Amino acid sequence: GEAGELRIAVECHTCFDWLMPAMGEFRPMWPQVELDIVSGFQADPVGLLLQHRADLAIVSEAEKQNGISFQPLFAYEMVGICAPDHPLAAKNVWTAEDFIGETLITYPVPDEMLDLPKKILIPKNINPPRRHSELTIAIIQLVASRRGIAALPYWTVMPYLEKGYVVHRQITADGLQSKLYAAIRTEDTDKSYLNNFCQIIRERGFADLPGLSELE
Amino acid sequence: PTEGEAGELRIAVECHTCFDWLMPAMGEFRPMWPQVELDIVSGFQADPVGLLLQHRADLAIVSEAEKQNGISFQPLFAYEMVGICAPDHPLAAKNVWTAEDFIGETLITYPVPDEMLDLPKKILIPKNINPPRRHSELTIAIIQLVASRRGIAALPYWTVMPYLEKGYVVHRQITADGLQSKLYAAIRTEDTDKSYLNNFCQIIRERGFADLPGLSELEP
C-alpha cells in the first residue's frame, strides 16, 4: 500500500448501506491506498482523527474544531415507522409526546448517537422504553409485528413500504433532518484520494438514495 | 364468530446470517396468520433451546439437533461454509484451505463466542488453532474488510455469492471434506400440534430452497 491509508471511522449503522459499496468503487480506482474500518467504539469518531487512529470520519455534526476540516456529504429526513394498524398511523405528524407510551426500537448505541432522542426526546424529558437491534431488517420486522416504533432515514425505510411491513410518518411539525459530513485532519485537505472518496460517497448516494438534499 | 387462529410466535435466534432468510419468512407468515403475535428473542449470546424450556420463546433456529427432552427438532436445510479472501491474497492460490492455513491469518467473524461459529468449533479449536480475530455485526462490513486484505472469513456460499459477482472476494473450500452447516427449527414437544409453528418452518424451507443457491435437504 505505497500511497498510504484510508482508515474510515464510522459509528452510524445506516451509513454502512452506502459506505460499503462506496469502498467497493474506490478500491480499484486507488489500489495502493490501504482501506480499513475503525468502528464499534460507540463514541464521536472526530477524536480518532486527532489521535491519528483514523484518516476520515463519517459524522452527523460539523462542530467547528481546530485541526479538523469538514466536507458536506448529504442531508435526509428521519421518518417515524409503525405497523399499518398501529394507532400512530392515524397521525400524519408525530409530536415528541406521541413517543411517551411506545417502545422505541433503535441500534444498540447511546442516545448521544441517535438523532431522535438527542434532538427531540431528551430536551423534552421523554425517555420511552427501549428495544435494541444491530440489524435494520430485524428493526422493521419488530416494528411490523407491533413490538414498538422506530426512527429511520426515509431512503432505508423505502423498500419496506413497498412490502407493506410498515408505514412512515413525519417526526415533528418542523420534521427531523440528519446532516452527513466527512471529517478529515486539516493537514490532509490536499490528499486527492480522501477528497475523491467523498465525491464517490456523494455521486453514489445522490444516484441510489431517494430524498437526499445538498448540504451547504 | 371467529377471527382466525390466535397465538404467539417468539423466535429465538443467535445466528447473524439467519436474519437474511428469517426476516422475509416472517413477512410472508404475518398476513397468513394475522392473529399470531410475532417477536424476536435475541442478544443473549447463548443456546436458544433453553428459552423454549423456560417458555421465553416458542421456536428456535439452531445449528444442531441435540436430542433433548421436552424439545422437538425440524430440519430446515444444510449449506456449505466457504472461505473468503481478497483476489490478491496468497490463499487464493490454494483451491482447498486446511486448518493450518488459518494459523497466520486474521479471522473476521461476528462478535460472538467460538461455540456459535462452525469454522472454529468444528475445525480450528480441535486442532488447537486460535488465529487473531477481527469482529463485525454486519456481513457487508466483513466482505469489505476481507476485500481490503484486512483478514479472511468463513461465510455461507449463498451469502458470499452476490459479492463474487462484484469482484470483492474469491471463495475457497474449507478442508478436503468441506465445511457444512445444518439448520433446524426447535420447538417444545407439547407444541408439535400447533399448525402455525409447522407452517412457519415450511415457509422458511420453501423460501430458502427457492432463493438461496447451494442448499441441500436435511434428514431426518
TrEMBL record, chain A:
Can you list the GO cellular component terms from the UniProt entry?
A: cytoplasm
Per the record, the domain of life is Bacteria
What subcellular locations does the record give?
Answer: Cytoplasm
Q: What is this protein called?
A: HTH-type transcriptional regulator MetR
What does the UniProt keyword field contain? Activator, Amino-acid biosynthesis, Cytoplasm, DNA-binding, Methionine biosynthesis, Repressor, Transcription, Transcription regulation
Q: Which GO terms describe its molecular function?
A: DNA-binding transcription factor activity; transcription cis-regulatory region binding
**Entire protein: which part is shown?**
92 to 307 of 309
- Please report which protein family the annotation says this sequence is part of: Belongs to the LysR transcriptional regulatory family.
Cysteine pairs forming cystine bridges in this chain are: 12-15
- The reply to whether Amino-acid biosynthesis figures as a keyword in the UniProt entry is yes
GO terms of biological process kind: methionine biosynthetic process; regulation of DNA-templated transcription
